[PDB]
Amino acid sequence: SDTRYNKSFINNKHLNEHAH
């Protein structure tokens, strides 16, 4: 919960490649 120069691992791997 403190990765400013990362942004939560690139927005959660781009939402796991767009998959809800």
Side-chain angles (χ1 to χ4, degrees):
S1 196
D2 200 277
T3 218
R4 288 79 177 90
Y5 196 72
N6 190 240
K7 305 297 293 182
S8 168
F9 199 53
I10 306 159
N11 173 246
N12 194 264
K13 290 272 69 62
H14 200 2
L15 280 299
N16 194 266
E17 299 171 87
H18 201 2
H20 197 5

